[PDB]
Amino acid sequence: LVHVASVEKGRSYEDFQKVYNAIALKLREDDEYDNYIGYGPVLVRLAWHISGTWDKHDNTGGSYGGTYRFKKEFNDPSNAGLQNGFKFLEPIHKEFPWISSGDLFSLGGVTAVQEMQGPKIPWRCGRVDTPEDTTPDNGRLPDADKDAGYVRTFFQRLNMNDREVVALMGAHALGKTHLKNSGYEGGGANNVFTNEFYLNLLNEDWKLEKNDANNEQWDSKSGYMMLPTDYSLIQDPKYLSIVKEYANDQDKFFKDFSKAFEKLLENGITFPKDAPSPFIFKTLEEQGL
Ligand code: HEM
Numbered sequence: 001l002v003h004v005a006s007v008e009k010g011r012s013y014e015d016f017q018k019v020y021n022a023i024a025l026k027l028r029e030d031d032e033y034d035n036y037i038g039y040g041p042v043l044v045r046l047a048w049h050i051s052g053t054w055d056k057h058d059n060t061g062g063s064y065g066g067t068y069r070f071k072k073e074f075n076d077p078s079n080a081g082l083q084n085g086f087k088f089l090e091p092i093h094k095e096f097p098w099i100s101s102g103d104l105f106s107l108g109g110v111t112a113v114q115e116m117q118g119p120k121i122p123w124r125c126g127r128v129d130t131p132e133d134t135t136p137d138n139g140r141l142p143d144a145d146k147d148a149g150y151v152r153t154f155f156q157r158l159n160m161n162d163r164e165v166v167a168l169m170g171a172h173a174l175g176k177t178h179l180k181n182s183g184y185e186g187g188g189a190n191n192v193f194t195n196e197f198y199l200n201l202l203n204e205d206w207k208l209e210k211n212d213a214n215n216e217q218w219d220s221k222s223g224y225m226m227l228p229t230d231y232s233l234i235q236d237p238k239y240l241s242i243v244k245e246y247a248n249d250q251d252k253f254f255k256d257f258s259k260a261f262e263k264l265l266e267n268g269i270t271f272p273k274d275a276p277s278p279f280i281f282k283t284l285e286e287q288g289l
Contacts, residue, residue, distance in 0.1 A: 001059040005126030005271045008098050013279050016107070016125060019096050020281045021289065023111040026088065028284070034176070039088050040112040040191050041175025046085035047109025047265060048171070049078070050102070053136045054267045056159045061140060062268035065130030066101025072132075078141040081181035102127030106265045113261070114283050116174070118193030119254040122262055122278035124271060144184065144227040145215065148236035151229050158267060160260070166242040167256040168264065172230055173197040183213035186225035195254075198247035200224050201234050 008015075023043075031038045050068045053061030067073050074083070089108055093099065099107075103125050110121045142154050155165045173196045176187030190196070204220035211217055218226040233239040246253040262278075 003059065003062075003064040003128075003130075003269050005124065005269050005275055006128055007126050007276065008100065008103070011098065011125065012276075016123075016279055017281055019092065019099055019104070019107060020111050021284065021287075022092050022095060023089070023108055024115050024284045025289070026092065027112065027115050030088070033084070035189065037175060037189050037191050039085065040116045042082065042085040043088065043108040043112035044171055044174060046082050047106050047112075048168075049082060049141060050105045051264045051267060052142075052158065053140045055136075055140070055157055056267070057157070059268050060134075061136040063102045063106050063265055064127045064269050065134050066103075066105065066127060067130065067132075067135040068105060069101050069129075070132045070135045072135045072138065076138040076141070078138065081178060100127045101129050109261070109265065110281065113193055114281065116191055116193040119258040120280050121258050122280055124266060124269075124275070124278045126271070126275065127269065142229070144182065144229050146229055146232070148232035148239060151232055152236075158264070160264075162238050163242055163256060164260040164263070166233060166239055166246065167253065167260045169230065169233060170195060170197045170246060170253060170257055171261075172227075173200075177225065177227070179211070179213055183211070183215045184217055184225070184227060185211050185213075186217070186219065186223070188224055195246050195250045197230075198243050198253070201226065201230070201243055202247050206231065 027039055033039050051063040055061055073079065085108065089104055093104055106127065107123060110123045113119070113121055151165060152162070160168070173188065173190060173194055176189050177184035179185040204222060204224055206218040206220055206226060208216055209219045216228060218228070218231045233243050
């Protein structure tokens with residue numbers, strides 16, 4: 001199964017920077033969502049969930065086909081709450097109807113991370129919408145109530161190693177859990193990209209509590225929380241070493257996150273040898289906008 005990237009006809013860096021800017025401007029404007037968190041975190045989650053269906057064994061799923069637009073994937077219980085991100089992007093797509101759905105969803109994630117003062121994430125175009133029958137079945141996204149062994153094994157399907165996994169999980173510094181979406185409640189409600197996930201794991205006094213949905217979670221008196229899969233990163237000796245590294249080196253975390261997140265967004269896609277190189281978008285701030 002081969003998915004070859006194909007650049008939207010006649011489009012170049014300037015076209016994609018315009019789309020970036022439209023998303024970034026809307027992020028700034030629609031700032032009231034989720035008690036003033038804004039849409040940044042839910043867009044990062046959307047990019048991850050559309051990519052995280054990938055299976056290295058047969059090259060099914062992944063960001064290429066834009067299949068989240070189809071009912072089966074849109075209504076995956078693991079995707080509860082992402083409709084809010086989809087709605088955010090819908091007027092963007094109407095203004096730029098030439099962009100593919102996978103390109104839009106993935107670009108949304110890049111734009112959100114950058115606009116939240118995260119690292120630059122190189123991004124490549126050319127995902128092509130594929131038909132409804134290529135939509136992966138539900139159940140390929142991970143459970144939260146599990147341990148380190150589960151996390152490790154799970155991410156092997158996505159061709160991610162221990163360092164990639166720990167880097168990617170740092171995105172949990174963003175946003176929050178919502179009881180109605182996932183059965184977990186709480187979080188920092190933060191919309192600036194930092195390495196604070198690692199600092200919080202190492203520095204907070206964590207208590208194992210049961211929430212209103214009857215699920216266990218780790219809570220601190222500061223008001224932070226961790227999922228069991230989050231906490232597993234300090235229970236496993238290999239993960240713990242990497243957690244400590246990122247807690248003590250913000251730049252290293254940024255660099256590793258950028259590489260891992262691009263890889264996540266590109267899994268399953270074959271780029272022809274004459275495909276454009278990756279784009280690095282300027283932020284609104286860099287443009288003076
Ligand atoms: C074992 C892997 C993972 C599990 C079990 C997991 C689980 C969850 C759950 C249960 C929520 C709360 C959803 C809700 O209630 O609204 C959440 C939120 C989030 N996740 Fe993960 N996640 C995982 C990996 C990742 C990765 C790899 C990324 C990105 C690189 C990511 C980014 C986020 C973001 C940004 C939010 C906040 C969304 C919001 O504020 O609306 N997650 N995750």
